[model samples]
Target: ADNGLIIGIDLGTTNSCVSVMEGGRPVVLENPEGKRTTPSIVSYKNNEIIVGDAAKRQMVTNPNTIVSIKRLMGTSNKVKVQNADGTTKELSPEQVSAQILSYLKDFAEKKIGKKISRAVITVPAYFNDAERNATKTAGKIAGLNVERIINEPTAAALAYGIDKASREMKVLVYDLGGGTFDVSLLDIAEGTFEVLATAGDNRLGGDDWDNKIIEYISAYIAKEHQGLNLSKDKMAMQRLKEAAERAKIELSAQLETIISLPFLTVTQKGPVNVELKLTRAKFEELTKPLLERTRNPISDVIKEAKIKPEEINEILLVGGSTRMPAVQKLVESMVPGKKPNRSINPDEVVAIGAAIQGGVLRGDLEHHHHH
Candidate 1:
């Protein structure tokens, strides 16, 4: 017979994942549709608030759905949401975060076919006290017993530690998500993973890259199509942004992709026609600035930790933005000859680590023991 279930949550900037400990191993909980991950998107529609896939689909139509509100979590700034009744609602970042938490909770419950009441959630290592407290508050509001708030890098280390070969090694975790960038220097000693120092800019990451790409696409659209300025119409802007994101993702694998704006415009000039083909080199050139912004914090953390490149044995890459070839290339150059570990799926690794932590707390997981 199995004991009670414990949930592990990766409350990330771009996406959120939930898992649990079962049969002595960390198991990722799939959605009712059997999907392992859920989109961190929400929408208020048809007099009911919806989340995940429905909300993500709405991003193209509703630019104000607050997709990247995780960056604003714990901040004092109030997020403005436009209501359907010709009014606006002011919500604190904490409240917005609670909504996301609530969605995760619901998803877990629905998928497991059982109620999940406890979780160990992951957060950025450099998150200040206020931000950490706010994350706990979100868990509380979502009706989960948040056992602990694990540092993102620490979580990554734990996930990686089970397979690490060195007795004493320093791992630099470069985490870049939807809206925040974080670099953490971790010391994995004996079985303990300790964060020595960390630094990053919470205001920058993949979203900025997406915005820049979208801006470029919109400008090109305006120049090529007669009277088709996407910037003029909010809906048009949203559509272009969505298209740009898809194009960007596709460009990652292929040298060039043809972006078609099918039914995107309604003009008397008989619809707009624009071709967008982005090569890998062009994409790297356009996103180089965004990638460079991460260097300052990486350097800052390395200096703060008083560690040299060789001293750091492993460079662990975490977060979705690290998927960009430019990001990988730059990081490789930063620490010459040291190949960063890229086996972990940037989107799912954090949550798996959190689940392992949850198992540890529940006494289901134990460190390696001598025979």
Candidate 2:
């Protein structure tokens, strides 16, 4: 029943990435769109369907799009994605997720040059049994054998070379992403992972961080320009929405950022040109509320896991939002005197870990040569 090929998938909140073993190691596969990270957005027009960036672009102008499908994974609910004609169609989260997985499968098949039939997918440590079941079924609907469902932190650890660690270790993964945040405490002994405890809550993600910038900038502009309230305009806020996230991303690498939108909109008075220079300190202050919410989960995980932060041998960062330095320091401040592992590119870590797991299941467990 083995076909000698399997891929690992990180079915994530913001985006999904697929990875496969290559050169005796795991690597993420770039979709034909040239993105190793395929956005989880889906466009479900009545007669046409598309997934990823193109589908993501449809959200602003089209009513027939879906995002945050992962949030409803365990629920028996109908998602009403619209059509080009503005008519509604009901689809469940599993099938919507299936399209994303199916797209990745086809993309992977074309690249790997095989009719591969199996995969190892990842889910967060806190996902209940039903959520895990829904995710597995989505993979199955994508035509995969659905070999394994690994925990998010476990996958993140695997990406950091914890697959076969010489020493057993206690690892804490602080995963903050687009639509949710969670902390998982995982133990690795004999190359196996166990979830000791997981603590998290909903309504937190980098999107919330984006909202703070969007609001701060909109407020700044409205205060400066009389009779100008960009936030009230959907199109104006849409533009500002992206601009705000860019500044947030920029602040991760630079302390100061200049966000400008020339010809943002035309008022009877004149064309609006908004410019705001923001500092990292200002950004940290604005988002500190969110960072504090992130702290709660970390505290709960350590408490429930019955371990002190110091006793935790490793702290790993997962999800794209952790790319920000403040989040890095937040982890540093909480874990105090210990460096959180940033070696893995937080966005693709889980996918790479899944790929490593895929390798093991496919007779590459010992790294032996094939006959």
Candidate 3:
């Protein structure tokens, strides 16, 4: 009714994705970096506030870089962030989240050549009312109308546009992302998606896998550089963390990989370096405890929803973490006969679903909201 620039955003913890209705179909937009999803990170430098890939790339500005702000949403938590003038101030989680939202809004506007004032955003299903409300508030602060708020898994289901389906079915959506894990059971019939049960750990996800490697390698380095606390050396710690992440990513695809950092740091003796081999088997063993946490939630959903493992008609994996072969295998094993579905890009599907909902809200869909 207004400017007709209604859009949908998957406001994620580690990444953010945006999509919009172009009259006929929802199209996900690439950010300035030509990527469908933007890292949900923000940082402030001496005179500018940087966001997305730019913010994530600032390993040198670790103190000012704010990642995983979603974990602080709806709490009384205040993150001390560097101000534009190189000073410091505290920002509520919602306030910090608005920066990412506002950043995407600008990109969407520039690419579409329209000011996107109306939007529908998706949130984790396990999010309490307060958390859900905080997300809406962030959208408003980002200069959006926030026409609707939907569940992350529900949005993923909707993105497939199953309105034409003939029978009812139960679906289990396992979302293990950069910083959080959520499993949701949904009952679907035609266009209705009713969430049956939800379970998750707010702090559990793929990032934890990286941390394990970081600790393992840090300990190895400490042995050679006796009485050294890498924490005191921020630059070295930052480089090591990045290296750890790269090794984790490498192990996911290969059996083993080597981490080589030339002149990783300086010591009393001289410049020091790092080289280690990380095997996938070793990586899994190191993070087995974290993976165990996911087991309880997956099994709990079946019990809470009053269904057998075999009763789940479909299993959908949503999140970048689900890409790991170990994660995929575990997910498949948990379900008796069903294989996990990943036909859609896990990171972009939620945002595309949000866009589909936005289309309906804006009266651009073939049919109105389903009952």
Candidate 4:
């Protein structure tokens, strides 16, 4: 008779989402602004704190005050943020992450029409024990009693398995998120899911791609403006970062896109506009090395599992980065005849799976008491 909501949270590096089971199905909860996922960004301004989209908006004006903190989660480094009073406040990664969790918790409460105290949070499969424990600490600090900490790939498999309940096959889950990448080989027979092997680079992800684009733009600007230092101006760099991300997303669909920013830089004359045309071919060329990095991990996982590429019955693509045409093409080339499963929304699948796990755990808890 414990009647309380147990939410599932995908606390991702670039973005985060929360979901819950309702009417035998997992549904992602939207925030007050009706956004399904919140940017994993937090900003402190004028003694006030902001999270999600609002915080992301302030990144240009107050880069020092805003942080994409997931990268530091298990590290020993102390993260410092600028305050409105021109003082720096140092915080642990767990503390910074706690703020995000707290925001998600409140978001879930509003949607569920009740307070939720427990959650099952998903993390990258390759996260070490220290990182996992740090995630749990973040949950506790956010006032949540974390019921379980599940692997991101496992969670994605759970969602896929539950959806295709009658199928039994081997699946290779390629998860490339904003700040981390993981390749997991899994055996899904009937309803039982088993992980064969997992491999990844915690530091490799979409952020690196964004950085590459930034560097390309910076170099181009320097050549155009007699070695102008765009990076020196925080606002210019922020704008470039935003434009780079936009171009990356646009290229996934179109062959070419124009990146134009008016008043991108302030010069002795007045303001300078940046207009650049980017083609998918050029983008692919620039990111080819980063994509190649994934190949080694994929090979490592398959070899460690003693499975051939042909043995992978289905290739499930999870994570927003998987939407890239280059990534999809690479995965297709690897499996030859097989195509990566695109039915599930790469960005939301993990959260959906985490919700399913939360429901299962809750049911088990109830059954245990009855027994």
Per-model TM values vs. the true structure: 0.88, 0.93, 0.92, 0.90
Alpha-carbon runs more than 4 Å astray in model 3: 1-3, 82-88, 365-371
Model 2 alpha-carbon miss at residue 343, Å: 1.1
Candidate 2 per-residue C-alpha lDDT over 1-371 given as tens digits, one digit per residue, 9 for 90 to 100: 57667799998877999999887877789999899899898887676789998876655655677888998999999888666676678988999999999999998989988887899999978788999999989988889989889888888887887756788888888889988888888888987788898887667999999899987876776765767655466667668767888899999999999999988877788888778899999999998888888888888988898887788888898889999988888899888888888887889999988988788778754442221
**How big is the positional error of residue 298 in model 2, measured in Å on the Cα after superposition?**
1.9
Candidate 4 similarity to native, TM-score:
0.90
Show the lowest summed lDDT stretch of 10 residues, model 1: 362-371
Off by over 4 Å in 2: 84-87, 225-232, 365-371
Clashing pairs in 4: none
User: Where does model 4 exceed 4 Å of error?
Assistant: 63-66, 82-88, 162-168, 364-371
Per-model lDDT = 0.76, 0.85, 0.85, 0.83
Quote the RMSD, in angstroms, for model 4. 3.2
What is the TM-score (0 to 1) of candidate 2? 0.93
Residue 125 CA displacement from its true place in model 4, Å: 1.5
lDDT (Cα, tens digit) per residue for candidate 4, span 275-305 = 8898999999998999999888888988999
Give the clashing residue pairs of candidate 1, or none. none
| Candidate 3, residue 50: lDDT | 86
Candidate 3 lDDT, tens digit per residue, 234-312?
A: 7777777788888888887899989888887778999778888888898889988988788889989899999988889
